[PDB]
Design a protein around this ligand. Structure first.
Ligand code: MG
Ligand code: MG
Ligand code: MG
Ligand code: MG
Ligand code: MG
Ligand code: MG
Ligand code: MG
Ligand code: MG
Ligand code: MG
Ligand code: MG
Ligand code: MG
Ligand code: MG
Ligand code: MG
Ligand code: MG
Ligand code: MG
Ligand code: MG
Ligand code: MG
Ligand code: MG
Ligand code: MG
Ligand code: MG
Ligand code: MG
Ligand code: MG
Ligand code: MG
Ligand code: MG
Ligand code: MG
Ligand code: MG
Ligand code: MG
Ligand code: MG
Ligand code: MG
Ligand code: MG
Ligand code: MG
Ligand code: MG
Ligand code: MG
Ligand code: ZN
Lengths: 83, 149, 101, 141, 129
RNA sequence: UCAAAGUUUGAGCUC
RNA sequence: UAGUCGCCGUGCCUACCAUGGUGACCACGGGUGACGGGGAAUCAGGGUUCGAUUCCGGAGAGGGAGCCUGAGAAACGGCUA
RNA sequence: CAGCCGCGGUAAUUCCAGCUCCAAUAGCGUAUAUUAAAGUUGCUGCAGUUAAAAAGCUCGUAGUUGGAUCUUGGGAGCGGCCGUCCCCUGCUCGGCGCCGGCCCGAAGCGUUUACUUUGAAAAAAUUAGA
RNA sequence: CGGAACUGAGGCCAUGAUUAAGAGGGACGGCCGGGGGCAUUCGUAUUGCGCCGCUAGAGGUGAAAUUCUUGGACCGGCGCAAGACGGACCAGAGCGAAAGCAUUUGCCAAGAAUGUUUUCAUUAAUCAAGAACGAAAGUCGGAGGUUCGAAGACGAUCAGAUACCGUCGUAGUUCCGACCAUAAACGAUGCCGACUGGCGAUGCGGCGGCGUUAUUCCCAUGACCCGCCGGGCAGCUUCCGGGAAACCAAAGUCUUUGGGUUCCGGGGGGAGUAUGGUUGCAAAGCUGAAACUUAAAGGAAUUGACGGAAGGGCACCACCAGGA
C-alpha cells in the first residue's frame, strides 16, 4: 500500500516493532512485586536483575539470574506493579 | 560501528519519554543519599550502585527521580577515585594480559589485542586531559602501571 | 567474462581447505571443490549375486556391504563420463534429477 | 575531485602538480632532453651540406625507392637523412652544396614508407627547388 | 559518522518522490530543515508536514504531493557574492523562468529572488525545482 | 579407467 | 649589557654574559630557456599560456676592486691598479 | 603522390601533361612554438568488478570533517485573510525646558573572530564605454 | 571629606550543574564458537625390526626390463618401533585483522553478537610519517630424520625427450631457535553513514504461543512444533533503475552531475630495465627515469569455420558381412 498512516500506528504494531523503531522510543523492561508465602513484605525486583535479590531479614532466596527475565523460586508469587 | 572491531551491534538501554516519577515510589533523595554514603564507604562504583537501586529498591534512575546525578553527589562528598573507573579497569586488564604473555610469549593475538587496548587508553586519556581531571604529567608506563590497579 | 558465480567451488565465508590426492590420478584438488561421492555397494552387485547366490550354502543369507566414499578429479570425471556438459541456461539448474536413476 | 573539502586547496593543488608529469606531452615540453636532443633545437629550419645521395627502400604494401640525402649540419655536426620530394629534382642537387632543411609536419615521428626521415629540402644555393622544378629560374653556373 | 542530517533527509525524499510514495518519515529533526520546509510550504510546493517531539532530536512526517521534480543540496556551504549569484543560478537550474536556489542569510532564510530585492548576498544552502 | 597426429608458390583474397 | 662608527633605530661593528631560532603549514639546499608590474593572445561559464620591448620600479656599461672631486657619484662618454 | 585512409601491376575519377572545374583574391602557400576544440588532467567535470587501474590486513600523531540543545515575538498608525512603512541596547557639562525632579545632547566604556553590505582609498597608458 | 591595597562578619539572588543521540567507551547476566597459547590423552594405518606357518615367484605397464626373490620373496598371525596424519561425522556451516583454524582432558586469559529504565556525557570517522602480524618455497644453526620427493642416475616409448612412464634417490618436507614479507594475498569489488521490493530456508542470543515426547510423579528444563525481534554467512526473485554489454536490491539513488575521507590510472611497446638511494648473511624486496620505435593494443557480445569435446541421425563412392 501507498497510503500509510505513519502518525497513527496501532498498538499491536507498536508492540511488534523494535525497541527504538516504535514511533517513539520505549523500553521493554518492568518492575515487579515479588513475594514468598511465608515472609510478610514484598520485594521490588527489576525484571533484568543481574543480582541475587535476597528477601527482607535475609529469610530466604527468590531469584537466580539468567539471560533475560529472572526465574523465581518454587512457589513464589508476584504482581507486576504499575504507575 | 565499533572502533577496533568489525561488529556493529545495536543493543543498549532505551529510556522512556516520561521524566516523571511513578505514583507508588515514596523513597526520598535524602534517604537514598544516606544509602549512597554507606555503600560508597563500604566501597562501590556508581554503576553497581545504579544496578542495586534499580533491582531491589525498584528505582531505575536517580537522575530522573532526584535532580542531580550520582557521581556529582559522590564528588561532593569526596568518595570519587583518584582516576576514572574505566581507566582503572583497562589498566587492570592490560596488566593481566602482560602477565599472561610473560609466561606465554607466543600469544601473538594477545599482543595484538594488548596494543589496541593501549591505543584506546591514550585516546580516553586525552579526553580526560581536556576535561581537566588528570594533571599534564600523567602517563601510563608499563613499568609504573602495576602500582596502579 | 565471469564464467561461473561460484568458481566451481563452495568458498563463500571460509578461505582455505585441505587438498586431496585423486584416486585415478593423484591430482591435488581442494576438498571443497573436489567431487565427493558416497558409494555404498554390495561386494556382489546384481549379476554376480544371482550367480554367487548359487554359491551360497544357506537359503537367503544376507550379504554385508562395501561402504566406499569416492572422490575423483575433474578431467577424470569427464573422461570416466560421470558428468556431461550443459548449456549456459541449464547451468543454473542446480537441482539433481529425481531418483529414477 | 573526491576531497570536496573547503580547506583542501593545498592537497588538491599538490596532487595536480604531481600528476601533470605523468602526462607524456607536458613532460615532453618541460624537460630539456627532447629540446636538446632535437638537432633543430626548437627551430623551423636549419642549414646543412649534402654529403651523399641515398636510395632508401619503402615499407610494405607500398613499394618505392625514396631519394634521401645525408646532410651534416654546421652548428652541431649532427647527421640527417633529408628527403628530396618530387619527380626529377635530384639531378639538380649537386654534392657539396648548402641546402636549407625543414621538418615534415610530425614533431618527432616517422612518416609512412621512408623509415625515420623527418626532414625535407627547401632551397639549394639560394635557389628555390620549386622554382627549379617549375622552370622559372635557373641554377647559377 | 553521520555528518549531515539534511543531506540524508533530502535523498530520502527524492527516493520517495521517484516512487510516488505518499508520506515520509525522517528520523533526525533539525531547526534548519524545519525552516527549509516552511519555505517551500508557504510557496505551495508541498502540503502540511507534522513533527514528532521527543525530548530528543525529533522526527518529521511529510505528507508529499507530486509537484517536486528534485530538491537538492550543496555541500560544502559556499559563500556567494552577488557577482557569482547569476553564474550559480544559471549553471544550477533548469531555466531562467522557474526553479529556486535557497540560501540562508543574516537577514534570514529566503529565496534568491528575495535576496535580489533585499540586496543581500550570503551562504548557499541548496535548491529545488 | 588416455604412449602420437608436423609442414605447405614469392608468382596477386577484398568494398 | 656598555660602548664604536654612522645623520638617527638595529650584530652595523667591538667587548663581556645568556643558549637560543627554523622545520611535513615543505624550511634548508639544488633548478628556473625568470628582471617585476601595469598588460597581450585565447575564450560559453570556469580557466590556460605569454608579457626583453616606447609608462613605472630595479640593476649594468670588458672582468672585479678602490677613490678624489661634489649638495647629489662608490659616476664608467671622471681617475688608480 | 599521399599530414591520415590509400593510389600506381595497360580503358588510372588519386601520378606527369592538356582540356575543363573549385576555394580565396593582391594576396595565398609551407614549417615550428603555442591556444580552443580536450568532460584526453576534470574545483565546476574523468575514471578504478571484466577495457590500464584498491596498499595482503589491522593500529597510529599532524592533516581533513564532525549530532542535537539557548529569542521566540511585541506596540501604534498604514495598503489590497494577506503585505509594508514607524520602533525593539545599557551605565561630568547644558536646553524642546517644565514645576530639587524628568528627558534629551555630549564625553568615556563595552566578551571576541569568520561571513556579508557601504565608503574612502586606488598611478597613467590599456580594455569596455558616452 | 575624597581616592589605592589589605581584612572581619551580614541581608537579599526562583540562588549556581542543557538532554542523554537507532554517536561512542566502560560495567553486569547466562550463553556461543575447528577463536589463541601451553601442558596432558587416544587411534588406526604406515614403513622397519624380531619370531612362527605354507611356499616360488613378487613387482610394475599401454607392452617390458634394471629391481626384491629357494642365504625363504610375497601372503597370514603375534609382539615390538618412530614420525607424519587425526578420514569417514564435514554443511553453498561457524570463528579469526588476515594467512587460516577439527584426536581426548586440564590450566590461562579474550571477544564479536544478545537482554538491559547500568555509569561517563562528545570522549568520534578516515589517515602521508611510523609500527605489529603475515601460507608455500628459500636461508642459518641445532634436534629429528617415517613417507613422499627438486637435483641426479639408470631402465622404457619415441625421428629427437637430457620430459610425460619406472626403479632408486639428495637437499628440502617434521620440531625448537634465528631471518624473510613475496601469490590470481580474487568478491580481481577500500572504510563509515542514509534511503528505495518481495520470497522462502538457515546459525546465534532473546521473546511469545495449543499439543506431542523424556526427567517420571508434577514443576522447570531438554528434543520436536508454530511464530515475532536484532545482525550474520549465503540463496532465489521482477521492466526499481543503472550499466558498452556480461551483470548488480547494488556495480542503484549521475548532464536533475558535490554526505565524509584515503590510495591510485591517462596510447601500445621499450621497462618494473637503467642509473641513483635504501634494506638483507645471501636470495632478492622497495623507490624508480630516458632514448628509440610504432597506428593501433584490448573488452563484451553476433554469424561462421574448426574441435585428437559431448549428444542426436544417415550412406555398400562409409562401415558391417563378404566378393573381383
Ligand atoms: Mg579506523
Ligand atoms: Mg604426445
Ligand atoms: Mg611456398
Ligand atoms: Mg593596470
Ligand atoms: Mg621601467
Ligand atoms: Mg618596481
Ligand atoms: Mg649599469
Ligand atoms: Mg667604473
Ligand atoms: Mg663617441
Ligand atoms: Mg653615462
Ligand atoms: Mg590530373
Ligand atoms: Mg571544452
Ligand atoms: Mg589544452
Ligand atoms: Mg587483462
Ligand atoms: Mg585490467
Ligand atoms: Mg584491499
Ligand atoms: Mg590488488
Ligand atoms: Mg551537527
Ligand atoms: Mg586421527
Ligand atoms: Mg591462502
Ligand atoms: Mg603512508
Ligand atoms: Mg613458511
Ligand atoms: Mg617458511
Ligand atoms: Mg642456514
Ligand atoms: Mg616419486
Ligand atoms: Mg637418456
Ligand atoms: Mg619421477
Ligand atoms: Mg599477491
Ligand atoms: Mg562523477
Ligand atoms: Mg604507456
Ligand atoms: Mg605501422
Ligand atoms: Mg572416393
Ligand atoms: Mg554393416
Ligand atoms: Zn579429473
Amino acid at each position: 500500500p501507498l497510503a500509510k498512516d505513519l502518525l497513527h500506528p496501532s498498538p499491536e504494531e507498536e508492540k511488534r516493532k523494535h525497541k527504538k523503531k516504535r514511533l517513539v522510543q520505549s523500553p521493554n523492561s518492568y518492575f515487579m512485586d515479588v513475594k514468598c508465602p511465608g515472609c510478610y513484605k514484598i520485594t521490588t525486583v527489576f525484571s533484568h536483575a543481574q543480582t541475587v535479590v535476597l528477601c527482607v531479614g535475609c529469610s530466604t532466596v527468590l531469584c537466580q539470574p539468567t539471560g533475560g527475565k529472572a526465574r523465581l523460586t518454587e512457589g513464589c508469587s508476584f504482581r507486576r506493579k504499575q504507575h | 560501528g565499533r572502533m577496533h572491531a568489525p561488529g556493529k551491534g545495536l543493543s543498549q538501554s532505551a529510556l522512556p519519554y516520561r521524566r516523571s516519577v511513578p505514583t507508588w515510589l515514596k523513597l526520598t533523595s535524602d534517604d537514598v543519599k544516606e544509602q549512597i554514603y554507606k555503600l560508597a564507604k563500604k566501597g562501590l562504583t556508581p554503576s553497581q550502585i545504579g544496578v542495586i537501586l534499580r533491582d531491589s529498591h525498584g528505582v531505575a534512575q536517580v537522575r530522573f527521580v532526584t535532580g542531580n546525578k550520582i557521581l556529582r553527589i559522590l564528588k561532593s562528598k569526596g568518595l570519587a577515585p583518584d582516576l576514572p573507573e574505566d581507566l582503572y579497569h583497562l589498566i587492570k586488564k592490560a596488566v593481566a594480559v602482560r602477565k599472561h604473555l610473560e609466561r606465554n610469549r607466543k600469544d601473538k593475538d594477545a599482543k595484538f589485542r594488548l596494543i589496541l587496548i593501549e591505543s584506546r587508553i591514550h585516546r580516553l586519556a586525552r579526553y580526560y586531559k581536556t576535561k581537566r581531571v588528570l594533571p599534564p604529567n600523567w602517563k601510563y608506563e608499563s613499568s609504573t602501571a602495576s602500582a596502579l590497579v | 567474462t565471469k564464467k561461473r558465480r561460484n568458481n566451481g567451488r563452495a568458498k563463500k565465508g571460509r578461505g582455505h581447505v585441505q587438498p586431496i590426492r585423486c584416486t585415478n590420478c593423484a591430482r591435488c584438488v581442494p576438498k571443497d571443490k573436489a567431487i565427493k561421492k558416497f558409494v555404498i555397494r554390495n561386494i556382489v552387485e546384481a549379476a554376480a549375486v544371482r550367480d554367487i547366490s548359487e554359491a551360497s550354502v544357506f537359503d537367503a543369507y544376507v550379504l554385508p556391504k562395501l561402504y566406499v566414499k569416492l572422490h575423483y578429479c575433474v578431467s577424470c570425471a569427464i573422461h570416466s563420463k560421470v558428468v556431461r556438459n550443459r548449456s549456459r541456461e541449464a547451468r543454473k539448474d542446480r537441482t539433481p534429477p529425481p531418483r529414477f536413476r | 575531485g573526491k576531497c570536496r573539502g573547503l580547506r583542501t586547496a593545498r592537497k588538491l593543488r599538490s596532487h595536480r602538480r604531481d600528476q601533470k608529469w605523468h602526462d607524456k606531452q607536458y613532460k615532453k615540453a618541460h624537460l630539456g632532453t627532447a629540446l636538446k636532443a632535437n638537432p633543430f633545437g626548437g627551430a623551423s629550419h636549419a642549414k646543412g651540406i649534402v654529403l651523399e645521395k641515398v636510395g632508401v627502400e619503402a615499407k610494405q604494401p607500398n613499394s618505392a625507392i625514396r631519394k634521401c640525402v645525408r646532410v651534416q649540419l654546421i652548428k652541431n655536426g649532427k647527421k640527417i637523412t633529408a628527403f628530396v620530394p618530387n619527380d626529377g629534382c635530384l639531378n639538380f642537387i649537386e654534392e657539396n652544396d648548402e641546402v636549407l632543411v625543414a621538418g615534415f609536419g610530425r614533431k618527432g615521428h616517422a612518416v609512412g614508407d621512408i623509415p625515420g626521415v623527418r626532414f625535407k629540402v627547401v632551397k639549394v644555393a639560394n635557389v628555390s627547388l620549386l622554382a627549379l622544378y617549375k622552370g622559372k629560374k635557373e641554377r647559377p653556373r | 559518522v553521520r555528518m549531515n542530517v539534511l543531506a540524508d533527509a533530502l535523498k530520502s525524499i527524492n527516493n520517495a518522490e521517484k516512487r510516488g510514495k505518499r508520506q515520509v518519515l525522517i528520523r533526525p529533526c533539525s531547526k534548519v530543515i524545519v525552516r527549509f520546509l516552511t519555505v517551500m510550504m508557504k510557496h505551495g510546493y508541498i502540503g502540511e508536514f507534522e513533527i514528532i517531539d521527543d525530548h530528543r532530536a525529533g522526527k518529521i512526517v511529510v505528507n508529499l504531493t507530486g509537484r517536486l521534480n528534485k530538491c537538492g543540496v550543496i555541500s560544502p556551504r559556499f559563500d556567494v557574492q552577488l557577482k557569482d549569484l547569476e553564474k550559480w543560478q544559471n549553471n544550477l537550474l533548469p531555466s531562467r523562468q522557474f526553479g529556486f536556489i535557497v540560501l540562508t542569510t543574516s537577514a534570514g532564510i529566503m529565496d534568491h529572488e528575495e535576496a535580489r530585492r533585499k540586496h543581500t548576498g550570503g551562504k548557499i544552502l541548496g535548491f529545488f525545482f
